[PDB]
């Protein structure tokens, strides 16, 4: 149960209260006996003269560890700096105490860095392709154990593993993940975790039997001439726990519009991955006005995509091919939905859906890559795409997220690790090698350039050239190795980014 | 962990199932039980469909669900010797069991409520206290107390199905109920456990802006606060499947997704269904729960105010039972405002789509007075209003629309009885509240007489008995309770009667 739920209105008053300047802070704080009794105490205590609400939570509550500082030795290359953090961003957590909020998973896993002390959905992707590729293939299935464990436990894999992500999931990267294990451990593994894949396909496609045309309901829309797509969702529609007083704040400074609502749409840009951007947003101004769920994802659908044919895959691999074929059908339909609803052929390059205008959007984000990068793209398309990056997305530090400079985080002058490893490789699959090394380059020597500084790796890069920033990191570390490996000779590796 | 809802548990499979109607109820497969991990069981389930017979993939897969009264009974008796028939000792359940654990043993409504109720076990708790069963109340006290404990809430009843919802809220009763038998002890033991319960229904309120609702709250333009009935999920029940897809499926203009939260909301409500909430009585796919604000939720959160301030008063801390107080007196002020018409003369529902008092009578508008937060002259009124509208020949009319649902005449339901004249009662009506009784107690001992059996509910127009989409059922857990309670009451203390007697 997340930690609002559990704690009722004193979770509301230590967040309002701002006693952590962190509101993840309360949000992972361990209670120390019953929330039940601890809420009940508490109405009892508060005004009782002279209380002290900080008092209380030290009393009642352990708090995450907060004065500690990871030094590096000196003048270590990046790829050994890399490589020798695994360790340090490994976590072990088997068993937890009784109502913590951190949810327990059989085997050891990497975890961001940071204020991030779980695992991500998302990020283990291209975290385990770091892990992989500096062949620590353990922990590679480790992390794939654990969230097939998570689909076993609770029908999906949450954002991370926190009672207060339960409600989401993420940008779908497990069936990609079993595809990774299977290039080390042989078919073997598409066969071991079909059952789990399947059961994540159910989960995205749930309610999708009696979905009517022109209606959506949880992560499914259904459009007028029945074709089929996914968007992201939260079975919430209340303040983010981990963003508690932000999110009341955004609602409140839009009182024409139900906070049910609000609060809907920031879960739901959370799932994405996006939290946030003008991607999502009617006024790259205002964040609230976003509708994330009325916007039907380019990227989330590529994913889906690589589901429906990574499920065609490991249903041969279990010698089923009249299943296999099922799956074929299912993603022909949904590469028939993307080239429809998804591509703007005005412009020429993909984009999400609108389901307000019913009609596919103008703007141009990172987003655009993702058919490329499951081969759900026409070739003459994937070309325009190659255009349309260097035209609009390349710049010299890295892919910019977005062309708008909103403030917000999913947005231009950002680059992120993930959105510059899905473009590199997406523009490879179709030979367009050149913008593909340019993204690498310019990413990699942004990522080397702070490095050489401060001797970290970062959450997130400025593009413009080469809560506070997080350092590690879990998804900037795995793509680092990767280019770098990309942009060096395989028979002479670098250590570091060429100067030249 | 705590199982998904069998339709989650299973992906298509469940949907498939249903759809086949394979079992005449839909609730019978919503109760059945995996006998292997559900992910596995589908998976097996899509590679077999592409090798099939369901009804026997389902027979290998899954355990299915599965009384002669003594002779010559009185009315009395026979209640008194079902109790044991109707009791369930479920401490550990089977792994992905829709069956949630209890850890004491428990009494069933009966027949296909194969589980306990939250409503009907108030009603029921009075019939255990009032036939000497005290360890079995204290047992079903702790049994909910666990469930607030354990999930946050008491859900409707304990099954997976049902966790995204409550019902109509008598936690709070229960406790004082056992406070009748111990003394004070209940209240100070289950106060953490009653205030848990009312953050469920006031969560999200420290934040809720004026003309706006969310989850069970509703807060109106002039900012008074108010609950509604409400489920957290918003796709076709379990235990309705079929029913409930057909229901959405004859409006595809208005979101699915509304309807199926309006129907899980009024299951919520206890009164599953009823013209009380749909647009046209007639028409199903109308109802709007969610928009309409209820007379008796209201009047239940009135109560648990009140017993939250005698509770905390009881524990020692005058300064909480004052909050509570303040809280009851709002709520009252909200009631006789807002839950009342001014028109007709009678407690009702407050429309939020039309931002008016609702102008129909039904019998939850006795709630104020059961819960004593009525005026009383309005009391008087309703009285006046109860006897030239609802009063019938066999009992207590649910409304005066005979619109073929259950909670709608000529429906006469046990715990609408009770309320109304305990309410009735509390206010000196006393001629309306005997007339309730001894028409209600007459309709059960006829049917009681020829055919041995008390059911959910009763025709009170023509008395006997048997809209609803499953059979009438026996048992019957809150018509048993409600019976021994007017027995005793229209007989004299010192010469109790067994059977209702013939003539007054
Ligand atoms: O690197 C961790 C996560 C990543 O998964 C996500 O795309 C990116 C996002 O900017 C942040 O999201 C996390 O933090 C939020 C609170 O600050 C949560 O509400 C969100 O659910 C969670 O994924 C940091 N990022
Ligand atoms: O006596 C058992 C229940 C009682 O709690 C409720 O008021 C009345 C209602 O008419 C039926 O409700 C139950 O069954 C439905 C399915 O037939 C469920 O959807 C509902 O959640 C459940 O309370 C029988 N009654």
């Not at 992972?28 to 209380?56: C, E, K, T, W």
């Not at 299977?182 to 059961?199: I, R, T, V």
């Not at 739901?268 to 769920?293: H, I, V």
């Amino acid at each position: 149960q997340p930690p609002d739920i559990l704690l009722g209105p004193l979770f509301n008053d230590v967040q309002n209260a701002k006693l952590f300047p962190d509101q993840k802070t309360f949000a992972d704080a361990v209670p120390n006996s019953d929330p039940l009794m601890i809420l009940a105490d508490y109405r009892m205590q508060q005004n009782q003269s002279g209380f002290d609400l900080r008092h209380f939570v030290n009393v009642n509550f352990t708090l995450p560890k907060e004065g500690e500082k990871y030094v590096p030795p000196e003048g270590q290359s990046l790829r050994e700096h890399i490589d020798g953090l695994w360790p340090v961003l490994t976590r072990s957590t088997e068993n937890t105490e009784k109502w913590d909020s951190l949810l327990p998973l059989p085997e050891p896993y990497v975890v961001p860095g940071g204020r991030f002390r779980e695992v991500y959905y998302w990020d283990s992707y291209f975290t385990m392709l770091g892990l992989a590729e500096s062949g620590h293939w353990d922990k590679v299935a480790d992390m794939v154990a654990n969230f097939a464990h998570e689909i076993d436990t609770y029908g999906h894999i949450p954002n991370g593993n926190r009672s207060y992500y339960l409600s989401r999931s993420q940008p779908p990267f497990f069936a990609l993940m079993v595809e990774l294990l299977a290039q080390h451990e042989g078919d073997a593994a598409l066969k071991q975790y079909l059952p789990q894949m399947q059961k994540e396909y159910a989960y995205w496609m749930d309610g999708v039997e009696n979905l009517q045309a022109g209606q959506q309901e949880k992560r499914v829309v259904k459009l007028q001439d029945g074709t089929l797509l996914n968007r992201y969702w939260d079975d919430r529609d209340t303040p983010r726990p981990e963003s508690w007083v932000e999110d009341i704040a955004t609602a409140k400074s839009n009182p024409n519009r139900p906070a049910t609502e609000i609060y809907r749409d920031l879960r739901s840009a959370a799932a994405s991955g996006w939290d946030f951007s003008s991607r999502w947003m009617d006024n790259p101004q205002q964040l609230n006005t976003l509708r994330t769920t009325s916007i039907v994802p380019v990227d989330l659908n590529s994913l889906m995509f690589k589901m429906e044919k990574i499920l065609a895959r490991a249903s041969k691999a279990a010698g089923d091919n009249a299943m296999a074929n099922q799956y074929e059908t299912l993603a022909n339909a949904r590469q028939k939905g993307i080239e429809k609803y998804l591509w703007n052929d005005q412009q020429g390059w993909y984009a999400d859906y609108d389901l307000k205008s019913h009609k596919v959007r103008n703007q141009l984000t990172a987003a655009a890559l993702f058919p490329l990068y499951v081969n759900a793209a026409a070739k003459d398309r994937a070309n325009k795409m190659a255009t349309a990056t260097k035209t609009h997305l390349l710049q010299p530090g890295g892919l910019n997220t977005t062309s708008v400079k909103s403030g917000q985080q999913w947005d231009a002058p950002n680059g992120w690790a993930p959105l510059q490893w899905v473009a590199t490789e997406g523009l490879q699959n179709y030979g367009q090698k050149e913008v593909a090394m340019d993204i690498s380059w310019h990413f990699l020597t942004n990522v080397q350039h702070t490095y050489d500084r401060e001797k970290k790796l970062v959450e997130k890069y400025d593009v413009s050239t080469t809560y506070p920033l997080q350092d590690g990191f879990g998804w900037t570390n795995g793509v680092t190795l990767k280019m770098l490996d990309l942009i060096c000779p395989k028979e002479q590796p670098c250590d570091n980014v060429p100067a030249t």
